[PDB]
Coordinates of C-alpha atoms and ligand atoms in Angstrom, one line a residue:
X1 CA 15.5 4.0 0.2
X2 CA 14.4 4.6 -3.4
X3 CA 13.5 7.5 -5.3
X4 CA 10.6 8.9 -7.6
X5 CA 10.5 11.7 -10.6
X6 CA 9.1 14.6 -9.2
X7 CA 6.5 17.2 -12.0
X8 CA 9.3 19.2 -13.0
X9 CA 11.9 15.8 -13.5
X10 CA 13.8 16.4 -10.3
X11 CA 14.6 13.3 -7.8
X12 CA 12.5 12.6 -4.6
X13 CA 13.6 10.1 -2.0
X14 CA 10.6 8.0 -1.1
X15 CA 10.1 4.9 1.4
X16 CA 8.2 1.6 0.9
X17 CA 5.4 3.5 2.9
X18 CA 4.0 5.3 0.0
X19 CA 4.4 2.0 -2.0
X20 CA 3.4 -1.2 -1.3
X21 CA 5.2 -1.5 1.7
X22 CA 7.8 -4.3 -0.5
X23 CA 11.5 -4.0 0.3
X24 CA 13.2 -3.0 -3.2
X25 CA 16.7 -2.6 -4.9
X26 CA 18.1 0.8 -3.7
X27 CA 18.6 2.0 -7.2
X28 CA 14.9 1.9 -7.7
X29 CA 13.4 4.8 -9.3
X30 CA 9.3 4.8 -9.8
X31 CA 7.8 7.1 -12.8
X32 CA 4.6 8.3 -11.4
X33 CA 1.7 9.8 -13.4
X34 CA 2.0 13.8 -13.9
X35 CA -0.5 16.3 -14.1
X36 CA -0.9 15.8 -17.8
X37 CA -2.7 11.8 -16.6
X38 CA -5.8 10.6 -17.3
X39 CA -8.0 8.2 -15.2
X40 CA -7.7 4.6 -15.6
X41 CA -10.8 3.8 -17.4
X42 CA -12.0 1.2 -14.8
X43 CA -14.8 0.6 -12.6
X44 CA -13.4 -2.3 -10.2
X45 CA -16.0 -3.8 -8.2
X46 CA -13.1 -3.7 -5.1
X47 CA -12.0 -0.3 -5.8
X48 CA -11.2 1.8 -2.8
X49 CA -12.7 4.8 -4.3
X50 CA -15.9 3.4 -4.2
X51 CA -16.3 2.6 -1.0
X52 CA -15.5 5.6 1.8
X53 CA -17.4 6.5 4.5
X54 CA -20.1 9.2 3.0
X55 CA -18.6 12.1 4.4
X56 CA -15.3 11.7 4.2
X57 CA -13.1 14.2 2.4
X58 CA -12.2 13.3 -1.3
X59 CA -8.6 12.3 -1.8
X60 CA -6.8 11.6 -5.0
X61 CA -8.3 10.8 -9.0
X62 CA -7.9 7.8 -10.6
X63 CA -4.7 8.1 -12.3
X64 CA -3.4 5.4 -14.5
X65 CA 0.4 6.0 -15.7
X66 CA 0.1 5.0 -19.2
X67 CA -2.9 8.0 -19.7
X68 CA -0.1 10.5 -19.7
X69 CA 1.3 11.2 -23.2
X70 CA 4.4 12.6 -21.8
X71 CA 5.7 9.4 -19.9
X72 CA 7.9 8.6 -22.8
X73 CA 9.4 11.7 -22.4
X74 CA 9.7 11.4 -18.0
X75 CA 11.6 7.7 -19.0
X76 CA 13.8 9.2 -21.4
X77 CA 15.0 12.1 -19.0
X78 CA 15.5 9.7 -16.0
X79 CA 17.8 7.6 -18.1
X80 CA 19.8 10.7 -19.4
X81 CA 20.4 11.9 -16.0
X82 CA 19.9 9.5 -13.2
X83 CA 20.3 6.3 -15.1
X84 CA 18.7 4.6 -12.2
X85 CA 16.2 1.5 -12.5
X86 CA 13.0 2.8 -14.3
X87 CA 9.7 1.3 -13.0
X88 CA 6.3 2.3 -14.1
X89 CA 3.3 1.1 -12.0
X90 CA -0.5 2.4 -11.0
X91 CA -1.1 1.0 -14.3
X92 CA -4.0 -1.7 -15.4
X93 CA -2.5 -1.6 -18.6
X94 CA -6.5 -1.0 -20.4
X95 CA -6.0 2.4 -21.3
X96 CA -3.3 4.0 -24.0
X97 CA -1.2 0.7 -23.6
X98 CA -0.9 -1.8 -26.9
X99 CA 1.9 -3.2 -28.8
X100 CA 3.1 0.5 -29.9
X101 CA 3.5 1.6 -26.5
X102 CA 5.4 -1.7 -25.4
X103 CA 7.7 -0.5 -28.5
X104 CA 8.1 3.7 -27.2
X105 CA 8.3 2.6 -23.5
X106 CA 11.2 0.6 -24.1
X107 CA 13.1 2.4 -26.7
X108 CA 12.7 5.1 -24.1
X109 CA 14.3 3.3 -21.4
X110 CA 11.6 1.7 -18.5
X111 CA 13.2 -1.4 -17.1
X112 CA 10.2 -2.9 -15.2
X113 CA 6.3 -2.2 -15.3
X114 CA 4.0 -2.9 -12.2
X115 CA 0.4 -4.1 -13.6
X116 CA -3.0 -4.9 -11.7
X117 CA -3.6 -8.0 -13.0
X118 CA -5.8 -9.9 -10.7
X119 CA -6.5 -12.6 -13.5
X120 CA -5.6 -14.2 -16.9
X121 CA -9.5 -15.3 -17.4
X122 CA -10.7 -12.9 -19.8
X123 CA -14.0 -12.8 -18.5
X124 CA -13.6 -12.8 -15.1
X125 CA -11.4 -9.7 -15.4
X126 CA -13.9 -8.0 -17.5
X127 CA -16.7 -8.1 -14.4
X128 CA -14.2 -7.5 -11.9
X129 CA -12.8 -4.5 -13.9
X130 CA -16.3 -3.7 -15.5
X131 CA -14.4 -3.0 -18.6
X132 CA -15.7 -5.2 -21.8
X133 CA -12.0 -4.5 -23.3
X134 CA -10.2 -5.7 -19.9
X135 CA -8.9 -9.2 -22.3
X136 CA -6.7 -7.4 -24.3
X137 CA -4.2 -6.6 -21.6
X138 CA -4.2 -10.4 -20.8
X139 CA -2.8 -11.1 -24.4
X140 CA -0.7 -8.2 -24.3
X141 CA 1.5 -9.5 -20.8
X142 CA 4.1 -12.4 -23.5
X143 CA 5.0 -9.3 -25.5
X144 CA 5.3 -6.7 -22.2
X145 CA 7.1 -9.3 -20.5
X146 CA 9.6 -9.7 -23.7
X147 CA 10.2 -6.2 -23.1
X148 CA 10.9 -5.4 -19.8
X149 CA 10.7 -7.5 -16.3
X150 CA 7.1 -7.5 -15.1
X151 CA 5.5 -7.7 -11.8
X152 CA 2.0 -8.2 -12.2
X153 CA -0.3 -7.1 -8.7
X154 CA -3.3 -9.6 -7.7
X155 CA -6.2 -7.9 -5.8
X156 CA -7.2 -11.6 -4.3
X157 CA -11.1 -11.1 -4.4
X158 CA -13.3 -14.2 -3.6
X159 CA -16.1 -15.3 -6.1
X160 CA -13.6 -14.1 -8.6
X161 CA -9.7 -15.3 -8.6
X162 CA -9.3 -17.1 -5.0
X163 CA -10.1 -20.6 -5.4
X164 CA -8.1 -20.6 -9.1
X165 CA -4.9 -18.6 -7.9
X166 CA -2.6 -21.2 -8.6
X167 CA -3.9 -21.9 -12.4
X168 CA -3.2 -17.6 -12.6
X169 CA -0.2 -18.2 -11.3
X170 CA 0.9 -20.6 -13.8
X171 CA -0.8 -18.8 -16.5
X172 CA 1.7 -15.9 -15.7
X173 CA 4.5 -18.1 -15.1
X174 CA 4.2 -19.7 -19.3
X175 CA 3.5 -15.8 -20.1
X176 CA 7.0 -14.9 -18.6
X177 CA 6.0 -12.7 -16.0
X178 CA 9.2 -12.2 -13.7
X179 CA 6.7 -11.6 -10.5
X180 CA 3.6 -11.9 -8.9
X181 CA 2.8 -9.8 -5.9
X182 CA -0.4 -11.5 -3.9
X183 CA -2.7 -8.5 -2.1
X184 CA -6.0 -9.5 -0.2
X185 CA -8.7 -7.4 -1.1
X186 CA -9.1 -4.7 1.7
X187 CA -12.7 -4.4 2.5
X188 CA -14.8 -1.8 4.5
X189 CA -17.9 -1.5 5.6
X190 CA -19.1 0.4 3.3
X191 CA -18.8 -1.7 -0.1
X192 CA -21.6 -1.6 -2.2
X193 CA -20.4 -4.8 -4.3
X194 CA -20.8 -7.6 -1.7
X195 CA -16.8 -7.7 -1.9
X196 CA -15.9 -9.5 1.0
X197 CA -12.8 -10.1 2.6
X198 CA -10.8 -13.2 2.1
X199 CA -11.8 -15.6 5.2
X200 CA -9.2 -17.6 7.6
X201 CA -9.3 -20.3 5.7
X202 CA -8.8 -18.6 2.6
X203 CA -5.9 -16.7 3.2
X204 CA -4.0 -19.7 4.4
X205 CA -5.3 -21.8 1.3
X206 CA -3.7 -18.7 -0.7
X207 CA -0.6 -18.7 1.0
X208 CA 0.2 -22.7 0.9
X209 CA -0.6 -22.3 -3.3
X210 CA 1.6 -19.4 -3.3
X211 CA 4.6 -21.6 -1.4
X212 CA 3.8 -24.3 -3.6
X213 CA 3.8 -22.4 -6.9
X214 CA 7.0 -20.6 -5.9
X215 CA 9.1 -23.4 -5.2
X216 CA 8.2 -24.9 -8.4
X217 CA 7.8 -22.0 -10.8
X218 CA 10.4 -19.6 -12.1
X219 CA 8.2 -16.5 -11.3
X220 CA 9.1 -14.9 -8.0
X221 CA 5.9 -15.1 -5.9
X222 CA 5.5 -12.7 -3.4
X223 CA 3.5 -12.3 0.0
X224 CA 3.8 -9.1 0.8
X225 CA 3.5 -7.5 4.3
X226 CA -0.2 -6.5 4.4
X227 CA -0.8 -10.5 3.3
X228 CA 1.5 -11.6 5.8
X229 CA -0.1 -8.8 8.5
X230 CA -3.9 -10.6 7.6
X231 CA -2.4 -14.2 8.3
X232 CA -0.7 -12.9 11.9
X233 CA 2.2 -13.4 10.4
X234 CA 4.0 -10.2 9.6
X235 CA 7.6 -9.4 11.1
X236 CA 10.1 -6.9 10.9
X237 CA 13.1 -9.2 11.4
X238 CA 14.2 -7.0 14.0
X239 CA 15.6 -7.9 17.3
X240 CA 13.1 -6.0 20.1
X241 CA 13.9 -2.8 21.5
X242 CA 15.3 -2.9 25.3
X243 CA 13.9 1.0 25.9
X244 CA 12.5 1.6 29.1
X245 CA 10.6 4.9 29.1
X246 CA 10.8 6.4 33.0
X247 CA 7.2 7.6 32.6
X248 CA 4.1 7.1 31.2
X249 CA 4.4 5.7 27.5
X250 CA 2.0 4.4 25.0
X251 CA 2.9 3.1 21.3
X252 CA -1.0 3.6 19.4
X253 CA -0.9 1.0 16.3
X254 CA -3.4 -0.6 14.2
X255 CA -5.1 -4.1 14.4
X256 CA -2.5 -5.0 11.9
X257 CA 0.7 -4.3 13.4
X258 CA 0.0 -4.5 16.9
X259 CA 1.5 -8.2 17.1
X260 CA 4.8 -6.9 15.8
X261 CA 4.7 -4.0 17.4
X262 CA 4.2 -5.5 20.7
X263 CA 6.9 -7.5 20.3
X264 CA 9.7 -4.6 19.6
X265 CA 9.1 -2.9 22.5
X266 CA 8.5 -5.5 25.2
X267 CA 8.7 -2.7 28.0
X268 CA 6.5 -0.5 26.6
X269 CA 2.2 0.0 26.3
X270 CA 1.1 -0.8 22.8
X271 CA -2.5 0.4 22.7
X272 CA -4.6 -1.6 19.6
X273 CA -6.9 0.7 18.2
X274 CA -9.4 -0.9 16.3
X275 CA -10.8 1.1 13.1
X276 CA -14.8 1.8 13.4
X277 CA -14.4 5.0 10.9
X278 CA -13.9 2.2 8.1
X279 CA -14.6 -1.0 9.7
X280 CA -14.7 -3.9 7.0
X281 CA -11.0 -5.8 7.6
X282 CA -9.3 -2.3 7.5
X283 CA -6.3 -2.7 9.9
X284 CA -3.2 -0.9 8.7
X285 CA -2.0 1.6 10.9
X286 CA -2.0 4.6 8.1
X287 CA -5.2 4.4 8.2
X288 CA -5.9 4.9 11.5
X289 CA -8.4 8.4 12.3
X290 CA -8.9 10.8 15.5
X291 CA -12.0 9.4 16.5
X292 CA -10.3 6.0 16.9
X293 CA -7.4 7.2 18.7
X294 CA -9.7 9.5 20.8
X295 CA -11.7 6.4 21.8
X296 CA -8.3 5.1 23.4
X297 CA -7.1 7.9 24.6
X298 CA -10.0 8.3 26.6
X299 CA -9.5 5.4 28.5
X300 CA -6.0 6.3 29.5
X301 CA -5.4 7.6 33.0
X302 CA -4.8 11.1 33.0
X303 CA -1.2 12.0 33.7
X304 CA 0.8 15.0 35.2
X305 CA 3.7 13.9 32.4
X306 CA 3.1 11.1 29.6
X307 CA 4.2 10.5 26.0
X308 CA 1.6 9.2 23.2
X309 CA 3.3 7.7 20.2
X310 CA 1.4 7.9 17.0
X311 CA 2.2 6.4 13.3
X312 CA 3.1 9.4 11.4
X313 CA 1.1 7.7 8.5
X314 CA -1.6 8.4 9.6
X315 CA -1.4 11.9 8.5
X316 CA -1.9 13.9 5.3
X317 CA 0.1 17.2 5.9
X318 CA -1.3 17.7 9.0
X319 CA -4.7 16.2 8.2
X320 CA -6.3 12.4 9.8
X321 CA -8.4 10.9 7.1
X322 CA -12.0 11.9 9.7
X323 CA -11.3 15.6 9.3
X324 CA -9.3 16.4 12.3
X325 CA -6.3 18.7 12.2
X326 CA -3.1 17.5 13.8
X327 CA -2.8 20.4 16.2
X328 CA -6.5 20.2 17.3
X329 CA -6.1 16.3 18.5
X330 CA -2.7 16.9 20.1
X331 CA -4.4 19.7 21.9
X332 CA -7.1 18.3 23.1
X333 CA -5.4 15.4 24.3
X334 CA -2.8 17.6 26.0
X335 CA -5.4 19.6 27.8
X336 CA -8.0 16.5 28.5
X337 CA -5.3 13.9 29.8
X338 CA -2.3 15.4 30.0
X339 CA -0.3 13.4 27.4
X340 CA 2.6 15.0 24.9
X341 CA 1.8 13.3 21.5
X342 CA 5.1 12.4 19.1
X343 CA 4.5 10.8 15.8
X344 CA 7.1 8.5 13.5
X345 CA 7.2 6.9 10.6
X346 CA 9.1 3.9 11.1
X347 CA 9.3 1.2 14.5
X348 CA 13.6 2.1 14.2
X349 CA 12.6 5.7 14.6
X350 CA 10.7 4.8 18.4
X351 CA 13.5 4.8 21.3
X352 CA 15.2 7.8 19.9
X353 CA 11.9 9.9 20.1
X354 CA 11.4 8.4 23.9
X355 CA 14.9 9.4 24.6
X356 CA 14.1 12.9 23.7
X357 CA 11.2 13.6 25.7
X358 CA 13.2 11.8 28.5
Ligands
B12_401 C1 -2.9 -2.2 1.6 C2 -3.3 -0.8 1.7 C3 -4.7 -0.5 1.6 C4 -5.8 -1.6 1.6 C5 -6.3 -1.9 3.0 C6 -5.4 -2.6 3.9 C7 -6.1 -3.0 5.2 N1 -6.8 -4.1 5.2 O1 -6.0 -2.3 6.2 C8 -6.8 -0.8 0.7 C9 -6.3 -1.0 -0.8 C10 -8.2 -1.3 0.8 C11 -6.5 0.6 1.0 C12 -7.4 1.6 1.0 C13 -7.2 3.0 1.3 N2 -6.0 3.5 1.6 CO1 -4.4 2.5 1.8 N3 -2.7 1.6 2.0 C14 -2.3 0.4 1.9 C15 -0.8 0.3 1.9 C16 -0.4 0.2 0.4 C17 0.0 -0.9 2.6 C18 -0.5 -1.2 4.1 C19 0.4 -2.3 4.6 O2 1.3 -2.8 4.0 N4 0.2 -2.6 5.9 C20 1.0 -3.6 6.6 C21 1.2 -3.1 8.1 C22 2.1 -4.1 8.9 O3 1.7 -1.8 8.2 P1 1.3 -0.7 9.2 O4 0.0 -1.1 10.0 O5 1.2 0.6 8.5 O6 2.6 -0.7 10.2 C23 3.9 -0.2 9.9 C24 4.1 1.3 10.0 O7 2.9 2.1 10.1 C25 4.9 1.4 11.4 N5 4.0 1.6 12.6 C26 2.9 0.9 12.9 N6 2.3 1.4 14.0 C27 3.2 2.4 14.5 C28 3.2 3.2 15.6 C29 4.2 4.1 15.8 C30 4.1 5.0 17.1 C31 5.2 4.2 14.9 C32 6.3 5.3 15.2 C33 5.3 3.4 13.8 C34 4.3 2.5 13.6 O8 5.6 0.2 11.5 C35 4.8 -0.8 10.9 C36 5.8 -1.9 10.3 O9 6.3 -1.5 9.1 C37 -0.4 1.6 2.6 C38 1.0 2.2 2.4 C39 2.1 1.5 3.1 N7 3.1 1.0 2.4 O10 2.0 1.3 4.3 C40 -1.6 2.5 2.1 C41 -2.1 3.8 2.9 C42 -2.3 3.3 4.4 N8 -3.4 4.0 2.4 C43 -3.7 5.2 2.2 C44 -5.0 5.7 1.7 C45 -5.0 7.2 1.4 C46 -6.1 4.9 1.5 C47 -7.5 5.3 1.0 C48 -8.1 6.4 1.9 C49 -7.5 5.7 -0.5 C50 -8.8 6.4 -0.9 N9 -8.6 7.6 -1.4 O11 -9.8 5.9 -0.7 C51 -8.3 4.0 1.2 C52 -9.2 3.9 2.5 C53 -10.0 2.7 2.7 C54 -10.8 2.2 1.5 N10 -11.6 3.2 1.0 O12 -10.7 1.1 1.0 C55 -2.6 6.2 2.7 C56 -3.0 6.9 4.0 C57 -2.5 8.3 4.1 C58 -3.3 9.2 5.1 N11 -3.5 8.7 6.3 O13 -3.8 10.3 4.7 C59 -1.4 5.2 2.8 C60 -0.4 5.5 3.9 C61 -0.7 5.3 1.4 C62 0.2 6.6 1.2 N12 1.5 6.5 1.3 O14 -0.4 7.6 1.0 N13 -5.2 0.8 1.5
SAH402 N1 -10.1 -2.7 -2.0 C1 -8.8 -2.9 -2.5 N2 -8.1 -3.9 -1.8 C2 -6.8 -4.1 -2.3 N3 -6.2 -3.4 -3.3 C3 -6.9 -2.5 -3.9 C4 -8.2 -2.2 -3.5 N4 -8.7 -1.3 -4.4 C5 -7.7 -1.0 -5.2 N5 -6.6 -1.8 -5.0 C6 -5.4 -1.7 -5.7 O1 -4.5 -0.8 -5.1 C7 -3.7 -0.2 -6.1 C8 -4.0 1.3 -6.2 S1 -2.6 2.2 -7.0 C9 -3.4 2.9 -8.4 C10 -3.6 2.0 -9.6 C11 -4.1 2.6 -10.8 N6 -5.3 3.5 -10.6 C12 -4.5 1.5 -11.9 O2 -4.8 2.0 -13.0 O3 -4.4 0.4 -11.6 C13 -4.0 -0.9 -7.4 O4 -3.2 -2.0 -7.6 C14 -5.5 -1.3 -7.2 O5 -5.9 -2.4 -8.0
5AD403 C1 -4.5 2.8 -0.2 C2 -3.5 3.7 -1.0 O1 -2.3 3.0 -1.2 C3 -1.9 3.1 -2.5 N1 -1.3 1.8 -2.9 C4 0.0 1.6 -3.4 N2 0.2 0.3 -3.7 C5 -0.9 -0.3 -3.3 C6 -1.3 -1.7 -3.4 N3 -0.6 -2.7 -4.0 N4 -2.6 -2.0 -3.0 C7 -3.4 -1.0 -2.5 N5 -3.1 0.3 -2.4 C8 -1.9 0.6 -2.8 C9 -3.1 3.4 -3.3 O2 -2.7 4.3 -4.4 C10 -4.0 4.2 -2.3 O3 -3.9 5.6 -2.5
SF4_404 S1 -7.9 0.7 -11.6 FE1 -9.7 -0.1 -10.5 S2 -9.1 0.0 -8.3 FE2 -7.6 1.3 -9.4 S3 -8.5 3.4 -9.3 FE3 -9.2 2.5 -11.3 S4 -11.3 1.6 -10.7 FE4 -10.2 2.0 -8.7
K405 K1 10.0 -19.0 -7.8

């Protein structure tokens, strides 16, 4: 339940789904770039961009908040007329962002930035960034964190900022940073870096100097759900769903959340479908494709009535991320198995879509 400014400064309600998936304040209102914004000036070794299958169909640029001039002017109206909370994120803070920005942004009104941090070592950040300048925003953070309450974002990447987490952390903490949000680096099989994900062992090491740091430290450490998700550990904090569908029924979910899943709906199939189109320790459930979900549908039975429930994520308009077209998989699933496929967005959403088709 929080909102973002839309190109022509209007409101849009948005979910934690096309964030990072953190609960936040219900006044939260997130300035995204506009048209008018420039790429981030990066190359980092991790990035996503850089590592999709070979023919899958480009996505988004690489916008960076701060490269659009007119932000200043986006905060100012928000504050006029919504007078919400004012966050600014997708930001590295290496391009168009110095000490006279930190002075417009807040006379304009933003009450919290969101920076990708990963490190305070100069150098490290520089090769993970590639960016010889990526030091600057490291002795910027005292003054941005004078300003206005900062979250800074860790890509956890090992050879690089794993086995010193908790010195970052305490580097942050004497900085002033309000928050530090902990995200293992996603990984697929097509990285040309030799990123690799964070092992077992690693992500628990991780998560006991997180524990550690925040029960010590002022800054408010945060494992968020896709850490907690790669530790088995992710919940909803939900008491399980009692629906009991009279016919056929299959929940499809990702590696991911197919342990929480499971749980909600005890009397109900929830099908894991493992991700081969990326591969690598991709697991989320948005980022599942046809080809994946048509390798489990095929070893359904075939049915004279059945539902198929798939995460609505999953789709981009009515686009999967492998090229298929919405109506062309529920189709062929219709006609090759007889299955009706639902999608939803979130778990809550689940027994009142069965009760329909029932
Ligand atoms: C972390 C993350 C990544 C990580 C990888 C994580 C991983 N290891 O799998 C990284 C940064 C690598 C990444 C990359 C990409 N990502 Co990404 N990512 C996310 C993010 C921010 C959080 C995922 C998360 O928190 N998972 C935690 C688990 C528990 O959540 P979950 O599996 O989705 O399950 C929940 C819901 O889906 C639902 N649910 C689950 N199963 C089911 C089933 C049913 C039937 C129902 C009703 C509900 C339901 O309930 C669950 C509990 O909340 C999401 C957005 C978000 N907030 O979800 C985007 C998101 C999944 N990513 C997206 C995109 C676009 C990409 C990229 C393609 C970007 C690009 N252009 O390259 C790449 C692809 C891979 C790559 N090249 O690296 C889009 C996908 C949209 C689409 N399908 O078209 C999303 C949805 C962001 C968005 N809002 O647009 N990503
Ligand atoms: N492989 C990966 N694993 C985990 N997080 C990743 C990732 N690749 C990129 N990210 C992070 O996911 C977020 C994408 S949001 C856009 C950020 C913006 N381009 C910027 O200037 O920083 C950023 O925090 C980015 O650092
Ligand atoms: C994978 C998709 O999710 C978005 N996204 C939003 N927040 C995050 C985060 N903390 N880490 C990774 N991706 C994120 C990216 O902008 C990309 O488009
Ligand atoms: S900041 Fe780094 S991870 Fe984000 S888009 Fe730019 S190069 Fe990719
Ligand atoms: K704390």
């Amino acid at each position: 339940h929080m909102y973002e400014l839309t190109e022509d400064f209007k409101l849009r309600k948005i979910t934690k789904y096309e964030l990072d998936g953190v609960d936040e304040r219900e006044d939260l209102l997130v300035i995204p770039p506009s048209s008018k914004a420039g790429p981030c000036g990066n190359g980092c070794l991790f990035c996503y961009l850089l590592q999709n299958p070979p023919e899958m169909i480009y996505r988004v640029a690489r916008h960076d908040t701060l490269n659009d001039p007119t932000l200043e002017e986006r905060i100012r109206y928000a504050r006029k007329h919504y007078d919400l909370w004012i966050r600014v994120t997708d930001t590295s803070g290496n391009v168009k962002f110095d000490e006279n920005r930190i002075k417009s942004l807040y006379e304009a009104g933003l009450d919290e930035i969101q920076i990708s941090v990963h490190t305070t070592k100069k150098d490290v950040r520089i090769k993970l960034m590639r960016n010889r300048h990526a030091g600057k925003l490291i002795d910027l953070l005292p003054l941005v964190a004078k300003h206005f309450r900062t979250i800074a974002d860790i890509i956890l990447t090992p050879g690089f900022n794993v086995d010193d987490i908790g010195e970052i952390i305490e580097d942050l903490d004497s900085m002033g940073v309000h928050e530090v949000r902990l995200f293992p680096v996603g990984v697929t099989k097509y990285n040309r870096f030799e990123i690799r994900p964070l092992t077992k062992e690693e992500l628990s090491y991780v998560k006991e100097v997180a524990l550690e740091k925040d029960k010590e430290l002022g800054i408010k450490v945060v494992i968020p759900p896709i850490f907690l998700a790669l530790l088995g550990e992710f919940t909803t904090g939900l008491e399980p769903f009692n629906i009991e569908p009279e016919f056929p029924t299959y929940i499809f979910t990702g590696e991911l959340a197919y342990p929480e899943m499971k749980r909600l709906f005890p009397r109900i199939k929830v099908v894991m479908v493992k991700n081969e189109f990326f591969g690598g320790n991709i697991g989320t459930a948005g980022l599942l494709t046809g080809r994946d979900v048509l390798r489990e549908v095929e070893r359904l039975p075939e049915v004279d009535f059945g539902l198929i429930l798939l995460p609505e994520l999953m789709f981009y308009g009515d686009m999967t991320l492998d090229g298929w077209r919405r109506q062309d998989l529920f189709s062929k699933i219709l006609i090759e198995k007889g299955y009706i496929v639902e999608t939803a967005l979130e778990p809550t959403e689940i027994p009142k879509v069965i009760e329909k088709i029932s």
